[PDB]
Chain A
């Protein structure tokens, strides 16, 4: 049993990209899917897809990196530089709308879940809604 499945997906991604994998299977939950939706919209992933490993259902996540650099260590810049859980089990984090944080003067996002559904910060802000601050990504 994963104690925090969301943290795990965020991590599975973090770990996958640092070795520049092509893709990574996370075991599948509606919620997780709803988050990748955002990642894919904002362009941190090339997109996700509901494969089906070994009997049970996953979300193959297709990753994205920069162009090959030059010098020593060509390895590309990461698109997902950084991706952290904010609220966690046993210390939940809920901002109201006046306190949704601004990630990197907007160069990054913060996914939060609201009663109008899973949204970025700019989205919640427009929609006039706060909620459980899920994570930040930049």
Chain B
């Protein structure tokens, strides 16, 4: 079975390609509690069909590039920029964590 993942498109910024964000719960090996944990896949979108916010199943597939080894299989739930926004703030944060601050 080619692995199939389900995720949120969080990047349209590429030609014929979408960043897909894929979460996975699971219990922590030593301490028990259920930990969320996520990873971004680059997926092949040849119609530039799928759009920011779409929730797509992504499938294992023969390599298209470095990075691109998945193709967008189908569309689950169309539109939902909460996830995109959720993800978006997470990278907004990054700005703070450095050597200075104030209004930066």
Direct A–B contact present (CB less than 8 angstroms): yes
Q: Which residues of A contact B (CB under 8 A)?
A: 90-94
Closest A-chain residue to B31, C-beta based?
A91
| Assembly CA distance A94 to B32 (angstroms) | 9
Closest CB in chain B relative to A94 CB, distance in Å: 8
Q: Does B33 interact with chain A (Cβ within 8 Å)?
A: yes
Closest CB in chain A relative to B35 CB, distance in Å: 11
For A94, what are the chain B residues with a Cβ–Cβ distance below 8 Å? 27
| Assembly CA distance A69 to B30 (angstroms) | 46
Count of B interface residues, CB-CB < 8 Å: 5
Q: Does B34 interact with chain A (Cβ within 8 Å)?
A: yes
Q: Which residues of B contact A (CB under 8 A)?
A: 27, 31-34
- Please list the 4 inter-chain residue pairs (A to B) with the smallest Cβ-Cβ separation, ordered nearest first: A91-B33, A91-B32, A90-B33, A92-B34
For A91, what are the chain B residues with a Cβ–Cβ distance below 8 Å? 31-33
For B31, what are the chain A residues with a Cβ–Cβ distance below 8 Å? 91
For A93, what are the chain B residues with a Cβ–Cβ distance below 8 Å? 32
Beyond the given A90-B33, A91-B33, could you list 5 further A-B residue pairs with CB under 8 A, ordered by the A residue number? Answer: A91-B31, A92-B27, A92-B32, A92-B34, A94-B27
For A90, what are the chain B residues with a Cβ–Cβ distance below 8 Å? 33
Closest CB in chain B relative to A12 CB, distance in Å: 25
Closest A-chain residue to B34, C-beta based?
A92
For B27, what are the chain A residues with a Cβ–Cβ distance below 8 Å? 92, 94
Closest A-chain residue to B28, C-beta based?
A91
| Assembly CA distance A92 to B101 (angstroms) | 39
| Assembly CA distance A91 to B27 (angstroms) | 9
| Assembly CA distance A53 to B29 (angstroms) | 44
Closest CB in chain A relative to B79 CB, distance in Å: 32
Q: Can you list 9 A-B contacts with CB-CB less than 8 angstroms, sorted by A residue number?
A: A90-B33, A91-B31, A91-B32, A91-B33, A92-B27, A92-B32, A92-B33, A92-B34, A94-B27
| Assembly CA distance A91 to B34 (angstroms) | 7
Closest A-chain residue to B32, C-beta based?
A91
